[PDB]
């Protein structure tokens, strides 16, 4: 029932010319894992536009929270979470964007098996996303065969290509995957670490010594599972960095 997922109007939402749907798809029956999605469609005049699955990283962060609410989503939230404003550059001006909270336990997505939240990993995250997709298409059969893309940021540099491969290999005929796009994403741990430190040093954010220490401490590690040498090194970097937003070097930090 895609119709049941249709949203009428969100609280404080301005009026728009496009539709949106949101709800759940069960990805693991045994476990009781179900992912929540939010679909923001393009307006009529742009239809039939592609379908783009958008994924945030973390791991453990919500596509709805980020992607949809402070990034490419149709709206932005008011202060105090009072209401919404329209994002004049929403990507749904040109595509049907599907935001997925994942894996289960993130955002509005949930698991009936408690331990699921202590055992999350890339493989399962991907297989469940795959499940989610096949099922979503059954629920939205008018999307079958639509040109389809998968996109995301940061930790999603793992999610995207991983899910992409699964889709590609699965050979599901109703899913017309045409490609993927990754923003500031993890691609290769080693190279990434190397580039990261170099960038920092070239942005005057760590000392010469800490630059070197980081290179020596983290080079053989994963970005997501650093060694203790790596963390010790990063702890110093962090102190050197001070109170800035590492996610945006020249913009202010939130005061509240």
């Amino acid at each position: 029932g895609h119709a049941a997922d249709r949203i009428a109007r969100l609280p404080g939402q301005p009026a728009v010319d496009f539709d949106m749907y949101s709800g759940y798809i069960t990805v693991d029956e045994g476990a009781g894992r179900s992912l929540f999605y939010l679909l923001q469609e393009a307006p009529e005049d742009a239809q039939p536009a592609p379908l783009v699955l958008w994924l945030n990283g973390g791991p453990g962060c919500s596509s709805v929270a980020y992607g949809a609410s402070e990034e490419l989503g149709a709206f932005r939230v008011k202060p105090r979470g009072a209401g919404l404003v329209l994002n004049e550059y929403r990507w749904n001006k040109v595509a049907n964007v599907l935001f997925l909270d994942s894996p289960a336990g993130v955002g509005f997505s949930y698991t009936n098996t408690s331990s699921d939240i202590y055992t999350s990993g890339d493989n399962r995250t991907a297989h469940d996303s795959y499940a989610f997709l096949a099922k979503w298409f059954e629920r939205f059969p008018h999307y079958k065969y639509r040109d389809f893309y998968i996109a995301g940021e940061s930790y999603a540099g793992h999610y995207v290509p991983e899910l992409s491969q699964l889709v590609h290999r699965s050979k599901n005929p109703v899913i017309n995957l045409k490609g993927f796009m990754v923003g500031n994403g993890l691609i290769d741990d080693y190279h990434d670490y190397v580039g990261t430190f170099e960038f920092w040093w070239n942005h005057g954010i760590v000392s010469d010594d800490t630059y070197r220490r980081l290179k020596e401490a983290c080079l053989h590690d994963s970005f997501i599972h650093p060694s203790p040498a790596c963390d010790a090194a990063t702890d110093v970097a962090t102190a050197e960095q001070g109170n800035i937003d590492m996610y945006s070097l020249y913009t202010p930090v939130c005061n509240i």
Partner: protein
């Protein structure tokens, strides 16, 4: 105009009963925890994560899919240089060397086209590109969707 406290607002908003209702979420009210932008626990209890996505890129490029990689050049968390060296490791040949792309009359960032993949930087944007350089972000997405190189003047 830019407001760094956005997560604060979202958290408020999504935690509203009315919103969940409208979204059809937490329907039976059985998610006993307040909504958060991320899950700490999961964040801190992550398991498997291959070190390199490269082989997949290799595969998919062979498979002929469209592959674009972008980077807001003022992010320090997963910075441009990181991407540059990573893509660099694929050793792909270049079709169009590093060039400035424009949005209007302003340089929106830079781009390099390789055989099989497009790399694009978004000038002055942090980690969350569509947040810091929303206009440029949209141009980027439109071209990607079209499979067209980022535009010169």
């Amino acid at each position: 105009s830019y407001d760094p406290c956005t997560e604060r607002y979202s958290t408020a908003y999504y935690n509203r009963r009315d919103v969940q209702m409208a979204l059809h979420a937490n329907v039976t009210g059985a998610m006993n925890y307040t909504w958060a932008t991320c899950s700490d626990t999961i964040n801190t209890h992550w398991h498997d994560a291959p070190r390199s996505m490269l082989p997949i890129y290799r595969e998919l490029i062979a498979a002929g899919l469209r592959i674009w990689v972008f980077s807001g050049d003022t992010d320090a968390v997963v910075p441009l240089t990181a991407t540059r060296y990573s893509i660099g490791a694929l050793g792909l040949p270049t079709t169009t060397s590093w060039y400035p792309w424009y949005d209007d009359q302003e340089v929106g960032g830079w781009s390099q086209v390789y055989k099989g993949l497009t790399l694009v930087s978004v000038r002055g944007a942090g980690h969350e590109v569509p947040l810091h350089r929303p206009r440029q972000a949209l141009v980027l997405f439109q071209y990607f969707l079209q499979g067209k190189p980022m535009p010169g003047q």
